Swiss-Prot record:
It comes from the Eukaryota. Integrin ITGAL/ITGB2 is a receptor for ICAM1, ICAM2, ICAM3 and ICAM4. Integrin ITGAL/ITGB2 is also a receptor for the secreted form of ubiquitin-like protein ISG15; the interaction is mediated by ITGAL. Integrins ITGAM/ITGB2 and ITGAX/ITGB2 are receptors for the iC3b fragment of the third complement component and for fibrinogen. Integrin ITGAX/ITGB2 recognizes the sequence G-P-R in fibrinogen alpha-chain. Integrin ITGAM/ITGB2 recognizes P1 and P2 peptides of fibrinogen gamma chain. Integrin ITGAM/ITGB2 is also a receptor for factor X. Integrin ITGAD/ITGB2 is a receptor for ICAM3 and VCAM1. This is Integrin beta-2. The chain holds residues 689 to 739 of 769 of the full protein. Leukocytes. Expressed in neutrophils (at protein level). It comes from Homo sapiens.
Length: 52
């Protein structure tokens, strides 16, 4: 473990919510995208009996 963890609180202007909203939506989209694509992609080969 060679990482650190600092605080992240303040509450800036309206930008606070604006950025948080876009970040959350985009995060959920890209996350679900890679997870869904990878899940169906990895599962595709899993279907067949060539798991070996």
């Amino acid at each position: 473990p060679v990482d650190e963890s600092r605080e992240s609180v303040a509450g800036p202007n309206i930008a606070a919510i604006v950025g948080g909203t876009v970040a959350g939506i985009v995060l959920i989209g890209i996350l679900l995208l890679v997870i869904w694509k990878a899940l169906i992609h990895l599962s595709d080969l899993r279907e067949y009996r060539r798991f070996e």
